[PDB]
Amino acid sequence: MILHALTQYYQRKAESDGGIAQEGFENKEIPFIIVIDKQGNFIQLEDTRELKVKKKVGRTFLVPKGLGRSGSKSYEVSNLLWDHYGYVLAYAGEKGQEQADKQHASFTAKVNELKQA
DNA sequence: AGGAGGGCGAGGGCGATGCCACCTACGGCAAGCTGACCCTGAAGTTCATCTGC
To answer: Which of A12, A59, A107, A116 is the most buried (most CB within 10 A)?
Structure first.
């Protein structure tokens, strides 16, 4: 009854149009967004924060759910299109290169295989 | 010598023993800090040791 009650009301929220994930998604709080055109070319880094007195990480976008990385070789995981700032621009604030470079290298391979599929 | 040393019954009868108004007035009764120090996690990887080849 602990987790059955959760699925029971998730089946009600998903059928009553309450704005929730639909098979493989998650309302992940994404801070800064990346704007492009039809062939790349970065445009603007818009931010959808400005909410509470403690600036959270943007708005909860209905993006695919995280696959749960966590590990020494956490770069080999990599999510779909949303991830980390070291997974997209290969820039690390307190992690350094190589460790964050492999993250972007695997994110590029994931994006390429998604485009091929 | 023999005496008799008071018989008697009244000793408070009357009423007030507090009249007032106060018994507090002031303003403080916290000021300063703590209220947590460390760990131990999910999840994948990684090294030297357990064992067979």
So the answer is: A107
